[PDB]
A paper describes a structure:
The mammalian proteasome core particle, 20S, is a large, barrel-shaped protein complex composed of four stacked heptameric rings, including two inner β-rings flanked by two outer α-rings that are each formed by seven different α or β subunits. There are three types of known endogenous proteasomal activators that bind the 20S to open the α-ring gates.
Distinct density for MG-132 was observed bound to the catalytic sites of 20S β1, β2, and β5, consistent with a previous study of the yeast proteasome. Inhibition of proteolysis by MG-132 does not inhibit diffusion of peptide-like molecules within the proteasome, indicating that proteolysis is likely decoupled from substrate movement in the proteasome.
Numbering used by the authors:
A (entry chain R): 2 to 233
B (entry chain O): 3 to 242
C (entry chain Q): 2 to 248
D (entry chain b): 1 to 212
E (entry chain U): 6 to 244
F (entry chain T): 4 to 236
G (entry chain P): 3 to 231
H (entry chain S): 9 to 241
Write the structure that this text describes.
């Protein structure tokens, strides 16, 4: 077995391999998540439409379980590995506890795996950051973020990937009880946040909503265009 | 010519011209000992004469030897690094034992040479270990081929020979033998010892004395490997 | 030994996996392989690179490989690694048919291989596989599907895609020539010759220099057929006639 | 051993003032057959400890080699420390229990007699790891024929001399020859004292009376 | 960079890691061994670095078996490790074949373990050379020395350490083949005292061991009385 | 240069710099003194406080009723060796029902500490230990080194400014054999003091004492229990 | 243990130089030729010894794998001996399961798999040998080449080793699809002769032939006859 | 070039010394031990208003009588806090007793330095843990506070500050700490020193405080109780 230490401390106490992983996340597409009162919204920038590419195969928003779903920025191949591990985990949890995993339970597991790959021999940190969003059994909307370092925090709204700082600055000044009262207002907040980074507008923006006690819904391109016009 | 790129000359990997310098440096180790070995086959005999250098009068000379018995009927002359040599003598002795236990007959000298050369090749393909710096010249009597002199090298190359030499004066010995064998071969007869003794004597300009050389011999009449005593070696040296 | 290790599975100061990027450069020097999805079927058109006169034709195809009874793939990159990945693809398909007794869905087969490819890019200390594959197939969930995978372990479904030499130029021409929803295997087997006639700058398509395979559903059975050289020659002839007519 | 093969019979032991004495017959039986009639089932572990064994003789031959090396290993260190008679008894209890727990027992009941620090040691070890120390020991049929007699004498006179101990051992060996069908009339007597362990050669209870 | 691993030959056919390992043995005090007709006597110049050290600390004469003794030079930690290997090889030989191991076989088997540390980069060559000596009625007296490379040869008188060459001149002026152990012990002490350099090496404790007909084929430390007579003869001879 | 980053690389002068480096760690630890009489072996340790509001650290440890250890170097490596020593002593009292000879334990530590010095990817142990034990051979003081070499000592000092102590010990070593426990303990305390930053004294807070003898199981005297020994200097 | 990291890796231009260097060793090997005729395949190799002190009948370059499959090579003979053993063991594993001689194409694929492993495994170098495998199966002659990379090719005629490019040009102008093994043996000797330098003799060259009867190595005496004409 | 376990010419281990620098970049955490209990305070260091301050957990409970304050790479701590919690429950299952704080600190400090790449284990750690821990609890010995560092060294501290402003809070701590200080006075002293070092303005949402008291269990102060103390601060 290859057992070299890929992730090692550097003078000044910096794990450069973890910092290089975050540079890959910064090269990723922008993913935005706003936690509303009865709706959690996740929207991703469809970089290039490609035109000759089936979109169903390049979706960056997935469902780990019936109550949880996640968006990612960074390497798509590393993400597929993390999503599959979290999907298997949610089912193993339902079998050993007979209850749906909590949003933070799965966020904790995804982070703990992303961390062990930063302190295990023969492995490179995962170059992906995720936005785990769901609804706890109590019905509380939940939004968490994971870093390639294994660090996770809960947020009211966040942005990952290219132009995260710009989008998060926008959400910092445009997030309020007002822009969250209506499910449509929550959706248009994510749309406007991405439109700050997305140049095409509407055509290059995937979006998904998970209302309480309901499966993840992928808004159709026409529905997205409706809000994009109303938000103009 | 000698282009290098990477650890071409530190580990066993191909040079820009596919050369494997590490094996080439393992052939320079064989000549670091300073001794030369000569093996000649005759009509019914195979002889292995080697140069014996007991540097100190405090060293027991009975322990300073390069001739070895792999099996009662297979003999070996080792040239190069002494510790690497004793390692291959042991692997040969074990492979010969495992052979009789699994097949029920003594191993042919060609088959012992191929096994040792196959193990040597693995040191040329793996980078965790250095090749062994030693050459083994094996001699035996095949039931259907008679006298057999085989040599394996640090690269994994093995071949059968009418007469061979290994060590510092390998080239000069080769030429000496590559003229007698051409005329009428190492004059076939247990006195084929004279060709070997004279080859080593001529190349290493020296009139050997009974104690300055070691001679091992296998014959169709007496197939068992035998190390000649100073008196027997003296008889041949006095004869010439 | 840390001195002789190349550290293939590590990041770069800019969050880049260079072994994967270098392998992708290798793929861009291999024979052009184009895939076009039509309403009646899917097609793979590769550029033959073994075109010496003393070569014997002893196989069904050099670049196209059947992995299932309903799936086939073409490869661009290192042939040795493609033989390894094609054998693994065939086992994954057989292992699924054993567990469920149904043919494997196409994207499920591509994901399995891409999971293996991605693992060589994160751990192990070994080089990645320098092979990008174009997969064509039919399933009872999405029907005729074309997919492309990379040494990174990243796959994607496409309506028309190219991999190999002059691949970018091909994707450009396919982009301006592919009519989504209005493509018949005839118009698909026509745009293939057009793209190959531009990607393969080496003279004009010579039939011996190209390989064309089609996957179609005939009476509830998926049929993969490598067009015979006679058929390919007729296609190249029609393209020449059409171009001349427009002149 | 799940099935004992060539076995030895009873081994006796008695501590006296100045050391201990062990006695065993020189016979190995193959199920009723006196097959090997010149074997020693007594061993000098070191200068202060002796060991007598009943049961499988190949299992005893294994212990003689393992304990023999254990002593050679210690005497190569030159540290000034040595295995005491009690330490050898502790190791044998640990060894017999370890094997019994693995369900692969050494079919052997051993009597360990020693002398160190002006103290006499006499310890018993069975194949199941049962071990104890006592003024007298009798394995096999000596547990029913010899121990009763030794215990009677060691009750009235708690401390015996070397002359008394040897006399009682030779008397118990005669009763074992008269009533043990797996016994033999050739025996060895080993004595551990401040001079070390001494083993006496083929002795005979030939002092047998047959008024029939 | 051809001298950083034992898995690398130089462009000249030399493994410099093993040559560097033997430089460590040449930086150690000398240990001399002389074979006579009665057996073998080992002698070591044990330099005492600290006066706060008990007598017998860092001993360089070991008992590898009832009949075999080991003199050592170079790293004592590596030497103690090879004494454990020699002790284990002798133990397994007695358990498998059922007799005292011949010193040639013990030497050959230990030399092979040493040579196994001269072929890979995962391990470093041992930094110690040792002399194994024994005496049996069937084999007689035997003296073998093993080097960091793993070469084993039998000698009539060997010397490992910083003064090996000077010690060898003195040992070569002796008729060991005709002398007896009782007479050799004084000569070993004389040579160790003559090779010792007080100006540089401060002070030393002469360590003496022997195996022979007198010890009945048992390696042992020369009796204190015999060692003291030897040291008195040694100092008197230096005069 | 390229001969001082691995323990499997001999320098051109026959020296492993990594063992020399690990041996520097012990010289970078609080001084610890150890001396033996004819009946007692005492270990005096100069505990060092990280801050004015921090306990010293605990430099003296128990291995078995007959053995105790004073530490110098990496405390984590010291705990790892202390556990190996504690188990080896438990194993001896479980199999032979006898206290493990102190000399034999030191042999085992030198064998365990030598292996990591000849294997690629492994580091020498960075702890120097002063072992004090009583046995059928009397009181014993031993010093172990990161190089895997050990020494039977009449008295020893390992740590920072420990040469000052070794100077005192070498001068007074002649009288230690025939000494009472308090005279012996005070001799050790005096030497540990000779290793103190000029303007500093041996308070009950900065000193620890471990003792073992014919009738005394290894005891670690700390805090007020050191007051009896300190009072009288 | 051993190194678990690949010694063969991708260069910035997307090339594995270690395999390129192994192909340099194959091009510095002694000349080898293979010709697939309509009734069999001839494998001929230049076997020139350094001196008259070598037993030419001791070690062979043309070697049988099964009874219908035979191999020749150009490169490092020690590495070739490893691949000959593996080819024979793979050929026997096939017979033990399907109880039929292994198809020559199946053997070339299985051997090429082992060769590719030495280009992606850890601590090992690629095999510095290119192999020419000839086999008779299903009443058809087969000639395949195997590169150090693990890539296999089917040929009608091919040359390897020193002067392989000029040899392939000669074979291109001489090879005729309608040929017999006897005519093929002559052209193979002529191809080696073009790049021999000396007098080709029954012992300076080694030839092996595969036909419906099976694979065999032409005896020095049989080769003596061919060299005469 | 150098592997994880290479000693410096000063014999210090580079990976352990770079992990200590990693802590100097963490949020300041202060721990004070009084007779009436132990107080643990930490700086949340919130980055954005959109973050949920509750998600930042720098003070955790190992058991009802033991709490822990972390500073440095927080993700690294998760595995260390998991070992502490399992070791405490294992001690309960085996001996039916609460584990002492020194025994919990010793069990976790043992996992540090257990790293390497020489096939040390299948799931062996590759590098040291870049975290410093302040364990505070109440055993049979009373309120106790221990500090553990990435070197595997643990110490009993009456008052200790770990993090970025330790080289300043410790000076302030050594100027306001008295053995007789009450828990309330200690709690106020922690917040005052934290408010000084903290870059942001200390509020009831940007700091975390918890206390272990002889009778009461580990208690994390809620905004209401924090606001009361911050009012006096």
């Amino acid at each position: 077995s290859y057992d070299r230490a890929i992730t090692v401390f550097s003078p000044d106490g910096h794990l450069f391999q973890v910092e290089y992983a975050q540079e890959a996340v910064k090269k990723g597409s922008t993913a935005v998540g706003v936690r509303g009162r009865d709706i959690v919204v996740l929207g991703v920038e469809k970089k290039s439409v490609a035109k000759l590419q089936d979109e169903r195969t390049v979706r960056k928003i997935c469902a780990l379980d019936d109550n949880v779903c996640m968006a990612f920025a960074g390497l798509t191949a590393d993400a597929r590995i993390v999503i599959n591990r979290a999907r298997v985990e949610c089912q193993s949890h339902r079998l050993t506890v007979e209850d749906p995993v909590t949003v933070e339970y799965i966020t904790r597991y995804i982070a703990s795996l992303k961390q062990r790959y930063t302190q295990s021999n023969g492995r490179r940190p995962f170059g992906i950051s995720a936005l785990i969003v769901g609804f706890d059994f109590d019905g509380t909307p939940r939004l968490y973020q994971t870093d390639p370092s294994g660090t996770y925090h809960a947020w009211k709204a966040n942005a990952i990937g290219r132009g995260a700082k710009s989008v998060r600055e926008f959400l910092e000044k445009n997030y309020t009880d007002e822009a969250i009262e209506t499910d449509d207002l929550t959706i248009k907040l994510v749309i406007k946040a991405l439109l700050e980074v997305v140049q095409s507008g509407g055509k290059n923006i995937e979006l998904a909503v998970m209302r309480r006690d309901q499966s993840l819904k992928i808004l159709n391109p026409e529905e997205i265009e409706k809000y994009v016009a109303e938000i103009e | 010519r000698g282009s290098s790129a990477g650890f071409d000359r530190h580990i066993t990997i191909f040079s820009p011209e596919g050369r494997l310098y590490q094996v080439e440096y393992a052939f320079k180790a064989i000549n670091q000992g300073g001794l030369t070995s000569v093996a000649v086959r005759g009509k019914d005999c195979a002889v292995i004469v080697t140069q014996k250098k007991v540097p100190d009068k405090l060293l027991d000379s009975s322990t300073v030897t390069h001739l070895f018995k792999i099996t009662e009927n297979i003999g070996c002359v080792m040239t190069g690094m002494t510790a690497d040599s004793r390692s291959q003598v042991q692997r040969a002795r074990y492979e010969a034992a495992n052979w009789k236990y699994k097949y029920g007959y003594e191993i042919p000298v060609d088959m012992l040479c191929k096994r040792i050369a196959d193990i040597s090749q693995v040191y040329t393909q793996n980078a965790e270990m250095r090749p062994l710096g030693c050459c083994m010249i094996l001699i035996g009597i095949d039931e259907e081929q008679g006298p057999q002199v085989y040599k394996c090298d640090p690269a994994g190359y093995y071949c059968g020979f009418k007469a061979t030499a290994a060590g510092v004066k390998q080239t000069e010995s080769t030429s000496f033998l590559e003229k007698k064998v051409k005329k009428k071969f190492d004059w076939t007869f247990e006195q084929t010892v004279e060709t070997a003794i004279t080859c080593l004597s001529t190349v290493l300009s020296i009139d050997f004395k009974p104690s300055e050389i070691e001679v091992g011999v296998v014959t169709v009449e007496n197939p068992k490997f035998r190390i000649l005593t100073e008196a027997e070696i003296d008889a041949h040296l006095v004869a010439l | 030994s840390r001195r002789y290790d190349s550290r293939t599975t590590i990041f770069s100061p800019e969050g880049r996996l260079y072994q994967v990027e270098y392998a992708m450069e290798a793929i861009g020097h291999a024979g052009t392989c184009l895939g076009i999805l039509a309403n009646d079927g899917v097609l793979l058109a590769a550029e033959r690179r073994n075109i010496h006169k003393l070569l014997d034709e002893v196989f069904f195809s050099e670049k196209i490989y059947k992995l299932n009874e309903d799936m086939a793939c073409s490869v661009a990159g290192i042939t040795s690694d493609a033989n390894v990945l094609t054998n693994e693809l065939r086992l994954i398909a057989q292992r699924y048919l054993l567990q469920y007794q149904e043919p494997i869905p196409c994207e499920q087969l591509v994901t399995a291989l891409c999971d293996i490819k991605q693992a060589y890019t994160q751990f192990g200390g070994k080089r990645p596989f320098g092979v990008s594959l174009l997969y064509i197939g039919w399933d009872k969930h999405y029907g005729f599907q074309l997919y492309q995978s990379d040494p990174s372990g990243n796959y994607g479904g496409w309506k028309a895609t190219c991999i190999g030499n002059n691949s970018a130029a091909a994707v450009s021409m396919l982009k301006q020539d592919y009519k989504e929803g209005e493509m018949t295997l005839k118009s698909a087997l026509a745009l293939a010759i057009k793209v190959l006639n531009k990607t393969m700058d080496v003279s004009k398509l010579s039939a011996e220099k190209v390989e064309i395979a089609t996957l179609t559903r005939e009476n509830g059975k998926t049929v993969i057929r490598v067009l015979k050289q006679k058929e390919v020659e007729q296609l190249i002839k029609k393209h020449e006639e059409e171009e001349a007519k427009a002149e | 051993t799940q099935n004992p093969m060539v076995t030895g019979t009873s081994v006796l032991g008695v501590k006296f003032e100045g050391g201990v004495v062990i006695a065993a017959d020189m016979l190995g039986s193959y199920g009723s057959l006196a097959r090997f009639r010149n074997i020693s089932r007594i061993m000098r572990v070191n200068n202060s400890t002796m060991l007598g064994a009943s049961g499988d003789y190949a299992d005893f031959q294994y212990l003689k080699q393992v304990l023999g090396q254990m002593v050679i290993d210690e005497e190569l260190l030159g540290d000034g420390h040595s295995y005491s008679p009690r330490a050898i008894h502790s190791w044998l209890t640990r060894a017999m229990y370890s094997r019994r727990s693995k369900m692969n027992p050494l079919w052997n009941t051993m009597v360990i007699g020693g002398y160190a620090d002006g103290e006499s040691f006499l310890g018993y070890v069975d194949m199941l790891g049962v071990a104890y120390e006592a003024p007298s020991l009798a394995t096999g049929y000596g547990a029913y024929l010899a121990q009763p007699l030794l215990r009677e004498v060691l009750e009235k006179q708690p401390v015996l001399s070397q002359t008394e101990a040897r006399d009682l051992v030779e008397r118990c060996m005669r009763v074992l020859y008269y009533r043990d069908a797996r016994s033999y009339n050739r025996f060895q007597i080993a004595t551990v004292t401040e001079k070390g362990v001494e083993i006496e050669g083929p002795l005979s209870t030939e002092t047998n009376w047959d008024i029939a | 960079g051809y001298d950083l691993s034992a898995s690398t030959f130089s462009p000249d056919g030399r493994v410099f890691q093993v040559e560097y390992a033997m430089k460590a043995v040449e930086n150690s005090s000398t240990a001399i061994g002389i074979r006579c007709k009665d057996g073998v006597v080992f002698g070591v110049e044990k330099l005492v670095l600290s006066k706060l050290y008990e007598e017998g600390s860092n001993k360089r004469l070991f008992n590898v078996d009832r009949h075999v003794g080991m003199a050592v030079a170079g790293l004592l930690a590596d030497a103690r490790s090879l004494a454990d290997i020699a002790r284990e090889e002798a133990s397994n030989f007695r358990s498998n074949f059922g007799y005292n191991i011949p010193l040639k076989h013990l030497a050959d088997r230990v030399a092979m373990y040493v040579h196994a540390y001269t072929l890979y980069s995962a391990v470093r060559p041992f930094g110690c050379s040792f002399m194994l000596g024994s005496y049996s009625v069937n084999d007689g007296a035997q003296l073998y020395m093993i080097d960091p490379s793993g070469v084993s040869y039998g000698y009539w008188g060997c010397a490992i350490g910083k003064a090996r060459q000077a010690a060898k001149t003195e040992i070569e002026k002796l008729q060991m083949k005709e002398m007896t152990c009782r007479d050799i012990v004084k000569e070993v002490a004389k040579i160790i005292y003559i090779v010792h350099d007080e100006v540089k090496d401060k002070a030393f404790e002469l360590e003496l061991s022997w195996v022979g007909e007198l010890t009945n084929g048992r390696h042992e430390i020369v009796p204190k009385d015999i060692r003291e007579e030897a040291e008195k003869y040694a100092k008197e001879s230096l005069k | 240069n390229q001969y001082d980053n691995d323990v499997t690389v001999w320098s051109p002068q026959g020296r492993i710099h990594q063992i020399e480096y690990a041996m520097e760690a012990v010289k970078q630890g609080s001084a610890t003194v150890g001396l033996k009489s004819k009946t007692h072996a005492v270990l005096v340790a100069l505990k060092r406080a990280q801050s004015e509001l921090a306990a010293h650290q605990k430099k003296i440890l128990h291995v078995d009723n007959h053995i105790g250890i004073s530490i110098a170097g990496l405390t984590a490596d010291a705990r790892l060796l202390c556990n190996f020593m504690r188990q080896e002593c438990l194993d001896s009292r479980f199999v032979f029902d006898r206290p493990l000879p102190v000399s034999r334990l030191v042999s085992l530590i030198g064998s365990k500490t030598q292996i990591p010095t000849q294997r690629y990817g492994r580091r020498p142990y960075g702890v120097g230990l002063l072992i004090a034990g009583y046995d059928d051979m009397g009181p014993h003081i031993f010093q172990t080194c990161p190089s895997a070499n050990y020494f039977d000592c009449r008295a020893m000092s390992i740590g920072a400014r420990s040469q000052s102590a070794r100077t005192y010990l070498e001068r007074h070593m002649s009288e230690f054999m025939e000494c009472n426990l308090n005279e012996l303990v005070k001799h050790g305390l005096r030497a540990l003091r000779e290793t103190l930053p000029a303007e500093q004294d041996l308070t009950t807070k900065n000193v620890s004492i471990g003792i073992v003898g014919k009738d005394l199981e290894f005891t670690i005297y700390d805090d007020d229990d050191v007051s009896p020994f300190l009072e009288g200097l | 243990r051993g190194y678990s990291f690949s010694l063969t890796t991708f260069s910035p231009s997307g090339k594995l130089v270690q395999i390129e260097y192994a192909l340099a060793a194959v091009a510095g090997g002694a000349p080898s030729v293979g010709i697939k005729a309509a009734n069999g395949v001839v494998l001929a190799t230049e076997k020139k010894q350094k001196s008259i002190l070598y037993d030419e009948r001791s070690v062979h370059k043309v070697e049988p794998i099964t009874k219908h499959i035979g191999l020749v090579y150009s490169g490092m003979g020690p590495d070739y001996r490893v691949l000959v053993h593996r080819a024979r063991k793979l050929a026997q594993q096939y017979y033990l399961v399907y109880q039929e001689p292994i198809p020559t194409a199946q053997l070339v694929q299985r051997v090429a798999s082992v060769m590719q492993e030495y280009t992606q495994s850890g601590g090992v170098r690629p095999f510095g040998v290119s192999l020419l495998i000839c086999g008779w199966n299903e009443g058809r002659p087969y000639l395949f080449q195997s590169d150090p990379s693990g890539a296999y090719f089917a040929w009608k005629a091919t040359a390897m080793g020193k002067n392989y490019v000029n040899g392939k040009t000669f074979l291109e102008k001489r090879y005729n699809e309608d040929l017999e093994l006897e005519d093929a043996i002559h052209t193979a000797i002529l191809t080696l002769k073009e790049s021999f330098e000396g007098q080709m003799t029954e012992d300076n060259i080694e030839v092996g032939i595969c036909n419906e009867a099976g694979f065999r190595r032409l005896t020095p005496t049989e080769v003596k006859d061919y060299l005469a004409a | 070039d150098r592997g994880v376990n290479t000693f410096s010419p000063e014999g210090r281990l580079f990976q352990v010394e770079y992990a200590i620098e990693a802590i100097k970049l963490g949020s300041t955490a202060i721990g004070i031990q009084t007779s009436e209990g132990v107080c643990l305070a930490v700086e949340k260091r919130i980055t954005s208003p959109l973050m949920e301050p509750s998600s930042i957990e720098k003070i955790v409970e190992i058991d009802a009588h033991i709490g822990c304050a972390m500073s440095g790479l927080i993700a690294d701590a998760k595995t260390l806090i998991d070992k502490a919690r399992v070791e405490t429950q294992n001690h309960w299952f085996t001996y039916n007793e609460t584990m002492t704080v020194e025994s919990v600190t010793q069990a976790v400090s043992n996992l540090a330095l257990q790293f390497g790449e020489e096939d040390a284990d299948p799931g062996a750690m590759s590098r040291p843990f870049g975290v410093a821990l302040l364990f505070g609890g109440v055993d049979e010995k009373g309120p106790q506070l221990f500090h553990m560092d990435p070197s595997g060294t643990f110490v009993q501290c009456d008052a200790r500050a770990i993090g970025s402003a330790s080289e300043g809070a410790q000076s302030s701590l050594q100027e306001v700490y008295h053995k007789s200080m009450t828990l309330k006075e200690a709690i106020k002293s922690s917040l005052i020193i934290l408010k000084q070092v903290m870059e942001e303005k200390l509020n009831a949402t940007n700091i975390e405080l918890a206390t272990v008291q002889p009778g009461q269990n580990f208690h994390m102060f809620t905004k209401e109780e924090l606001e009361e103390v911050i009012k006096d601060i």
